[PDB]
Amino acid sequence: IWGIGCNP
Amino acid sequence: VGIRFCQECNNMLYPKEDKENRILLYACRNCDYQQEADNSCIYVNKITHEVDELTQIIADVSQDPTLPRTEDHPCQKCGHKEAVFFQSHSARAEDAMRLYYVCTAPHCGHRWTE
Amino acid sequence: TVINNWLLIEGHTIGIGDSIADSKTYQDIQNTIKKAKQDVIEVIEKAHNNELEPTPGNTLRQTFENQVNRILNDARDKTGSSAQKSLSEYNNFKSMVVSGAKGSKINISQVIAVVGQQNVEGKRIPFGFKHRTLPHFIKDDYGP
Ligand SMILES: [Zn+2]
Ligand SMILES: [Zn+2]
16 A cells, blocks of 8 residues: 555 | 358358469369469468557547547648547557547547557 | 653653644655656656657566656655654654654655555556546546
8 A cells, every 4th residue: 555565 | 361252152262272273272162163362372470460450449439538638639631639549458469558549520530640 | 660650751642743744844745746747747658659668578568667656656755755854853653663662664654745556466556447447537547
């Protein structure tokens, strides 16, 4: 829910 | 290139080499009909399958409210300002983000790719 | 025991005032978001005009997605850094993050600046409807 590399 | 059918039983013809005159023929297997080959080409395969999708784009697509349109690009034929643009909308299009354009206004349906 | 009694003296809390940032911080966050959206628009225009060239090992779709994701993530990180600069010493979100008791700088940033990109299956929100994400968006919209 954050970014592509983070968390969903 | 294309497929042609027999004129008696409307079945599918097949290519056959004429051994005597060295002329390609198409013969129906279920009867004795034979017709000489005019095109001289049989099996064409485009592996890159590069096909202009302007042939696959319908003019009616100009009536879709869900598509975006711009007044920047005018039509070539009628010079209409509205033009509805969209991407390939096709699977196995390789990689193409090109915008295709369809002219709004009735019955023009001109399609340009820029 | 002794630290809990000192905490009875000093006290600890979380409120709305921790989530609020300076007006300048909010303005900077907004400017960063505007710049990022404009850069994504520029990348989309490059792809539409076919100027974009595929990155080695990636398709044009994949390289476009990677470039857009990079721009969006960089803007998100910059907004988060601005929000974290805004934090005071008295800020309690910062207190819990610095102590390590709970929370992270990502949580502070999302609370104060930008929630960030919502990604499903490692990609941006998919085109669930026909060539669009929701019915409210126009077809073939790759913007943020
Ligand atoms: Zn026949
Ligand atoms: Zn026209």
